[PDB]
Design an enzyme around this catalytic site. Structure first.
Site, PDB file in Angstrom:
ATOM      1  N   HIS D  62     -38.410  -0.534 -35.338  1.00 49.99           N
ATOM      2  CA  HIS D  62     -37.435   0.074 -36.252  1.00 49.99           C
ATOM      3  C   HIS D  62     -36.669  -1.024 -36.971  1.00 49.99           C
ATOM      4  O   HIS D  62     -36.951  -1.261 -38.160  1.00 49.99           O
ATOM      5  CB  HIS D  62     -36.541   1.069 -35.489  1.00 49.99           C
ATOM      6  N   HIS D  81     -30.921   2.176 -31.667  1.00 49.72           N
ATOM      7  CA  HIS D  81     -30.988   3.557 -32.114  1.00 49.72           C
ATOM      8  C   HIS D  81     -31.931   4.429 -31.270  1.00 49.72           C
ATOM      9  O   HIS D  81     -32.319   5.502 -31.726  1.00 49.72           O
ATOM     10  CB  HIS D  81     -31.363   3.688 -33.611  1.00 49.72           C
TER      11      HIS D  81
END
Ligand code: MGD
Ligand code: MGD
Ligand code: F3S
Ligand code: F3S
Ligand code: FES
Ligand code: FES
Ligand code: 4MO
Ligand code: 4MO
Lengths: 134, 822, 821, 133
Positions: D62, D81
């Protein structure tokens, strides 16, 4: 590393010197790679110049590499070996034949300030090579 | 993409026969880890080619479409490269545009094969879902068992491939055949390309001449080649290119003269019998000159008249082989009487001028100056096999061939050109009735219908009426199934069976892809193609090769022969559970783990002691063939029948059949047959009387079959976004159409749609539409008419053409330039 | 492998995410195929140093965020679609859905290969291409015939009304003008609900529009409620970029600087959701268990919960009596009608009394410094599709208004949103509430258009819908295929006659064939943002322009321009037949680009000489133009716009109701009664008969009906089939485990799913992915709707039966915990 | 040439790895942290005599935060996240915000020496234009 080949920038001629449907032979991106440019006289896809009608191609057949002939009248490239034909007015689309790739297009820059036509890359892989730039 | 990953010197290499046409070109598959690459120096890549400088012409067939990267079940990624074999005698390193796409058509999760079936699919609750193999088998076996128990085998219907190559072959035809004929024992079976269980070549085989009776070398040794109802540059490309054209160019003259030192060999000549002028005619004229080529541009459906006029003429001229007739034939004198037709009457019926008829006969049959008859090879395909009365045309043609001794001599033959490769090994068909399966389904017969390796929604004759009925009957089952809640397998089998008593039909498809069949099917099973499995098949000179596995199939896709075994074993288990030992025994003999097990059980058991009745193209010496022996033979394989095997000589086979005049009949003689000329069949004549255009149909060089892979190929879809119809330019002007307009084509049988393709050489009131396609199905306008053995006249239909409109994007993106070379 | 970097001088345009409400800002870099940027930071357009490893958080960049597109002129261009670090919405974050944008742009070889790019006609029992002109002649022909013989009541639509991709202010205006002003049909439903209605009738009627705050408010709150909402999965970057910084303590200094005489405790969060979700797991991870309350209510008991809380806060005096006195009506009445003791509330909801009291103390008891906590109340489909939409919102808003949690910073009572928004339409042209799916099922209508939706996958009671539509479509198929050589006029007549015999002509206007292709007769190709310019706003009303940068596939068109094409075809037909009055209804679609539709709709609302227009931009919408939005960049402007000039640009509105002027006759917020009635009988009947609550909703990775995802190999490997989360003890009892297939069924329908054991799922409860391409959840949802025809999608019970073990799922699909710890 | 030149980096020998006890290493350079683990039961791309040794880049795909290896669940977990990746499913993202599975480090297992060597990467490691800088 880098993802792109380093293509030369090869001057072909200036646009106003080309007569409609009178092809120009040149080599690109090296002397073993024969190519044709033609001003087709009516706009087409990838066409450059003021009338969006100048195109160029590798003339080596994408089946097994026989040089194709340019038929000025039908605006087609024709391979004498196994009878493939490619349409100059449809970005090298194979009309009929035994190839599995369209005829490679030579990308042309048209520079209005100088009138120059310059070959600057190839779309598609030319016959008989591992990459377009050897 | 402006580059190719070369195979390393030490890349894995296997043999692969082309998946597609009859010719069966030989290829190699190079496989290596994804992050490795070969060097440019010739000894540092597996091709042996020098990529440090431009390669000369003809050195290689190599494009990005001939490469891929596959992901195996274990997650490991491998480069693949699928390129023709220069040392294979079939193709000598040639690749057609169809076989050249093989690497692109191998399964990958992101490429052209993304939408492959990889799980059983069930239509339930008015939706497609995945299901388990076990559940699919319990439903499918459940319904077959219920049907056998209540209605008998007559309730269980199939339309199955009987061909070779991909979606066929000796293992797969045996597995399917054993299941349908020995285990289920249903007679309600048609074939992929014809609506009954029949032969394309009944008349020739009955007369004693099997339809693949020569070698491809014979085309090189001929004085004259006839191509009858055939477009070989497009449909048998590399046979035409690698064997026919060398003869026309003079490259084989020295071979003829060395074989036959006391025989004249004129320049070779070629005769086409085809109502339509094709790319094959164009190329022949380019290569040989107009004066070496005759195009007998017959009226549609007049072949029998043509051959009877030719036969009549050669007999009157004495351009026949009287000693051969006397020693090796029966029925000559009777055929001369029954088939009598003058050249004038022949000319009037066929439209071919008398002088062209006489020239064709003189080139083909008048003795040469040295005394010997010309070596004339007669090649035919679907223009007469799907012509006006299959049986009768072959009767007429073979009569001419037998009288002129054009079987059994080198450089001759009266042969099919073939479609798919071949690979048939099956039990005998289990009844003696001729059953028109599409008609029976349309009339409401059957409880369950399985399409297996075929898509008759696109390819049946009278296809619209078939679709309409199957959609209707399938919907009855859909409506009933979706009322179920919480149904066990047994309960749902019951619901389905009751819907079939109320007009319904349960529909299964066993396939690489969903296809248009998905609009009707209730169950779809995922199959595997060559390279995801081992496979054997032969080409149009009976040359059997092994295609080697090199990758895994997608998901849980399975070889067809093993799908058949799964079904058989599911049925055996059910019968055993219910204590029905007799029925369970019908399903024995499918204990197969690999496709070689099906090869052993079928091909290799034909004619062997203790074997059941087996109809095999390998014959009784098929047991001599094993996969290891085929592997050693390479892409040259062996021509069947195998004569011998030993370690030192390998497999030794048979080049040409009938070279001693021993034919496949009761008395060993070839049998002449009567060939009445009857005109067009009435069902067809009725459409011709009402409508303006002959709706000829057939192949395009670039498109393969129903476009099951092509429909996912961006280059294919850009070139041919819709089926096209070739039309005469003056006809186009009259209808105010041009290239890239859409028309409706229609008659009493159906309607379809195509993009107009003006073609100068098409005759007024004649047209030609691409068959079988995914966008505009030609077969909607073909009639129900069939010959005595239920062979359709697919090439025999007339209709009207109506302008829909200008499709601007076709005009902008699709070439309507001449596909005929000059 | 590798990425082609954008050259320093690459073309760059602005793009809002196509997908969820949050409306993250992105840049699209476009450059010629054979060119590439340098690794040195000043030699690529990213400004990043690729000569050595990048640090964490420096970039969001994968191959999936790149593509190569081929334009109509045949020229090939690299594209790279990456989040904008300077956009205030996302601060450079990208969700897994928006991150796939570049992959979901059209290319002939990639994930978009099967995009519609030509009109498609089902004729002669087969799909074929047809011309635009023919498609329009058939479709306008049937609409005209229907209007002439039956009236508008014969012409049915189900159309998007949302923003972002497959919506937006241009597109809702063009479709709305066509349906309502030109055709004038009332027979219209919305993509997500089966009548022409609002999700937020009660809140709007009480005076409170449902997008009444800024995303900054979540940063300023003391407490956030998430009610019927799974925001880490469904509003990802709002949760990540605004909520979690609050929970982490990163915004404490901001609160204290804004409010120097106010205490700010550590921020706390309260979820009202029967199901424990990824959002709860992450909140507990970040803030600790003691800062998070999960009020794990019994399904459908929201109204009881809020009435208990409201009753309690009033009894404690944890309300704002001066606000109530000055700015509200109906308080005393609501106190009486909504009375419920904590004991009774606990008994109904299943929530312990102590947790109810804790929630109320955190949220509403005054702070030590004297001020009430700033409590932001956020809600979504767990109550909007809950047990009686109107009543739950009545109950919730009562509690919010009494505690003054609208109009103060760090507060709000707001939808979280679904898609972006972008509504500008004429008024709906009747006053009847019409349940469109039921009317179609009963045989009404001659022609149905699905426009940017797929109710085969997403209707409530979806199986009954499919069954009916397939049946009625087949009647038309049968009739059409008997035609031979039919002219357009003749074919229109054939079709119309079939619709008099139970048939329905079905059109779909879409990016892809979808499941609707199994029923449709006509499909038309649409364009998405980037193939066209498009405006829309996010969940804080922030309007942005998404800029065109590529061509659509084939002849695909912006939906507003499809609407114009249809209108002009109808106008021309009426003009040819000398019907001047009917022709005039179809005027006003002389549009060549989507900016013409923005000018005609959004920019004309409330202007002199304009017709009645209902627009989220209001009467100041005319201040917005594409050039002004472009200048504003991906920060856009929060609506309503207050002012524009060259020097200040567009200036907008952060928070609504800050002076206590509500959207009602008297400017006051109106309290409403909220009766507690239990589950509706239709639902209770399924619950009495069947064992499992069939909860349903979103997965973080999957977008909606998986219209792009179905073509994505990574997506299909992860989720080959819809899944159902099930309690482990329940699974043991049914002898199922991860990757088995079950049938899920009740009286309404049957569907199938792959089992997904999840520890946190309660016994007798389940959760199935909604809307999917392989196992459609909606088959088991009931026909029940509230007074405004809002479905209780979350209210259905059913049984579960083992089909068997799917070997390949077991081998290839992870059934590990999606809840983080 | 179409391929990167990956180093061949020795990790350890297979018999030295204990079941479910990860080994940290860098590959294909010191700025690229990786984990190898013998999982104890066969999986996918697993090597060694029990087809159970796998390795991965641990940088989240990510935005690059280093992931932690949870030995118990056989997963890599990103704290930034909240993405998780399955070590037993070739890096499949179980849930989260990434658009690429966790890159697999290709391991050669040499029976003659018992050696485990890292020889390439499947997938693109976070934060680089190509795996080999
Ligand atoms: N490129 C390509 N090659 C293929 C295939 C493919 O799909 N693509 N399919 C394979 C298959 S399965 C087959 S069966 C073969 C088919 O191979 P062919 O039979 O060669 O091909 P067709 O186009 O079907 O028809 C051949 C010719 O029959 C002519 N014809 C039509 N009516 C008559 C008639 O009344 N009399 C005569 N004498 N001729 C007539 C047509 O004009 C046409 O040129 O091709 C195989 N090879
Ligand atoms: N990843 C992703 N994000 C999306 C979407 C997508 O497809 N994928 N779709 C977008 C759209 S259009 C929308 S409308 C939103 C939806 O966003 P949300 O409404 O947040 O998502 P849902 O999963 O539909 O439902 C939210 C929660 O409602 C709970 N719930 C169920 N029944 C009840 C009940 O009776 N009471 C209460 N209080 N809660 C209950 C469920 O347990 C679930 O966790 O998401 C948007 N965002
Ligand atoms: S390449 Fe294949 S399609 Fe026929 S001509 Fe050769 S077998
Ligand atoms: S990336 Fe897209 S899906 Fe939502 S969280 Fe941001 S708008
Ligand atoms: S080399 Fe050109 S057609 Fe074969
Ligand atoms: S950096 Fe790993 S989840 Fe975002
Ligand atoms: Mo065939
Ligand atoms: Mo929604």
């Amino acid at each position: 590393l880098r993802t792109t080949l380093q293509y030369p920038a090869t001057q072909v001629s200036v646009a106003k010197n080309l007569k409609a449907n009178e092809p120009v032979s040149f080599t690109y991106p090296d002397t073993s790679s024969p190519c044709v440019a033609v001003k087709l006289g009516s706009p087409v896809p990838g066409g450059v110049g003021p009338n969006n009608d100048i195109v160029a191609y590798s003339v080596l057949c994408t089946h097994m590499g026989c040089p194709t002939s340019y038929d000025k009248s039908s605006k087609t490239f024709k391979c004498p070996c196994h009878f493939t034909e490619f349409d100059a007015e449809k970005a090298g689309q194979m009309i009929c034949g035994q190839a599995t790739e369209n005829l490679p297009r030579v990308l042309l820059r048209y520079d209005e300030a100088s009138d120059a036509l310059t070959a600057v890359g190839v779309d598609g892989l030319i016959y008989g090579r591992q990459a377009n730039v050897i | 993409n402006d580059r190719i990953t070369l195979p390393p010197a030490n890349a894995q290499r296997t043999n692969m026969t082309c998946h597609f046409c009859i010719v069966g070109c030989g290829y190699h598959v190079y496989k290596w880890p994804e992050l490795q690459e070969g060097g440019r120096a010739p000894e540092q890549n597996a091709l042996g080619l020098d990529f440090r400088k431009q390669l000369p012409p003809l050195a290689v067939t190599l494009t990005p479409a001939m490469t891929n990267v596959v992901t195996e079940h274990n997650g490991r990624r491998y480069n693949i490269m699928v390129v023709p074999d220069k040392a294979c005698v079939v193709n000598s390193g040639l690749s057609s545009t169809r076989g050249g796409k093989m690497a692109s058509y191998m399964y990958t999760p992101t490429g052209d094969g993304k939408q492959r079936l990889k799980a059983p699919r069930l239509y339930a609750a008015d939706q497609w879902v995945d299901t388990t193999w076990d559940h699919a088998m319990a439903l499918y076996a459940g319904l077959i068992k219920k049907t056998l128990d209540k209605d008998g085998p007559q309730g269980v219907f199939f339309s199955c491939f009987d061909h070779g190559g991909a979606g066929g072959g000796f293992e797969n035809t045996w597995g399917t055949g054993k299941l349908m004929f020995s285990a289920i024992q249903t007679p309600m079976v048609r074939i992929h390309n014809r609506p009954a269980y029949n032969s394309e070549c009944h008349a020739t085989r009955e007369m004693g001449i099997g339809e693949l009776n020569n070698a491809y070398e014979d085309a090189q040794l001929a004085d004259v080649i006839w191509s009858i109802g055939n477009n070989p540059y497009e449909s048998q490309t590399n046979y035409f290119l690698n064997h026919w054209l060398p003869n026309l160019q003079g490259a084989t003259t020295s071979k003829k003269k060395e074989r036959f030192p006391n025989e004249n060999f004129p320049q070779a000549r070629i005769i086409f019998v085809d109502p339509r002028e094709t790319p094959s005619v164009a190329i022949a004229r380019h290569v040989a000159g107009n004066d070496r080529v005759l195009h007998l541009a017959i009226e549609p459906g007049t072949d029998t008249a043509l051959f009877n006029g030719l036969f009549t003429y050669v007999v009157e001229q004495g351009w026949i082989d009287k000693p051969f007739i006397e020693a090796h034939t029966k029925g000559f004198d009777d055929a001369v009487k029954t088939n009598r037709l003058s050249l004038d009457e022949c000319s009037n019926i066929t439209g071919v001028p008398v002088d062209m008829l006489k020239r064709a006969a003189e080139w083909s049959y008048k003795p040469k100056a040295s005394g010997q008859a010309p070596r004339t090879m007669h090649a035919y395909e679907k223009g007469i096999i799907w012509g006006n009365d299959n049986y009768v045309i072959q009767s007429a043609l073979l009569d001419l061939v037998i009288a002129t001794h054009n079987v059994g001599r080198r450089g001759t033959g009266c042969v099919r050109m073939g479609g798919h490769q071949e690979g048939y090994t099956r039990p005998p068909y289990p009844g003696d009735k001729k059953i028109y399966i599409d008609q029976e389904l349309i009339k409401g017969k059957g409880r369950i219908m399985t399409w297996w390796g075929c898509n008759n929604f696109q390819t049946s004759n009278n296809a619209q009426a078939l679709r309409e009925a199957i959609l209707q009957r399938s919907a009855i089952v859909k409506q009933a199934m979706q009322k179920a809640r919480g149904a066990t397998t047994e309960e749902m089998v019951d619901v389905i069976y009751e819907a079939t008593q109320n007009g319904g039909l349960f529909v299964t498809s066993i396939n690489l892809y969903p296809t248009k069949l998905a609009e009707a099917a209730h169950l779809m099973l995922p199959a595997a193609h060559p390279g995801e499995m081992n496979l054997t098949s032969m080409n149009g000179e009976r040359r059997i090769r092994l295609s080697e596995k090199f990758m895994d199939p997608p998901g849980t896709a399975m070889a067809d022969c093993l799908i058949a075994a799964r079904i058989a074993n599911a049925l055996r288990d059910m019968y055993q559970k219910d204590g029905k030992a007799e029925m369970a025994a019908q399903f024995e003999g499918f204990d197969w783990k690999t496709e070689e097990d099906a090869f052993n059980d079928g091909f290799r058991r034909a004619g062997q002691p203790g074997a059941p009745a087996i109809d095999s193209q390998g014959g009784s010496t098929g047991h001599l063939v094993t996969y290891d022996r085929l592997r050693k033979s390479g892409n040259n394989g062996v021509q069947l029948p195998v004569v011998s095997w030993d370690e030192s000589k390998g497999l030794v086979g048979t080049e040409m059949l009938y070279t001693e005049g021993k034919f496949d009949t009761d008395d060993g003689k070839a049998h002449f047959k009567p060939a009445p000329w009857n005109g067009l069949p009435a069902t067809v004549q009725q459409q011709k009387d009402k409508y303006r255009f002959w709706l000829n149909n057939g192949r395009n060089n670039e498109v393969w079959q129903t476009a099951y892979h092509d429909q996912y190929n961006s280059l294919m879809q850009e070139r041919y976004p819709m089926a096209y119809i070739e039309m005469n330019p003056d006809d186009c002007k009259q209808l105010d159409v041009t290239g890239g307009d859409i028309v409706e084509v229609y008659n009493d049988f159906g309607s379809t749609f195509a993009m107009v393709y003006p073609v100068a050489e098409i005759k007024r009131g004649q047209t030609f539409m691409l068959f079988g396609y995914v966008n505009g199905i030609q077969g909607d306008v073909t009639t129900d008419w069939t010959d005595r053995n239920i062979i359709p006249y697919y090439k025999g239909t007339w209709g009207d053409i109506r302008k829909v409109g200008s499709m601007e994007e076709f005009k902008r993106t699709v070439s309507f330039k001449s596909r005929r070379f000059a």
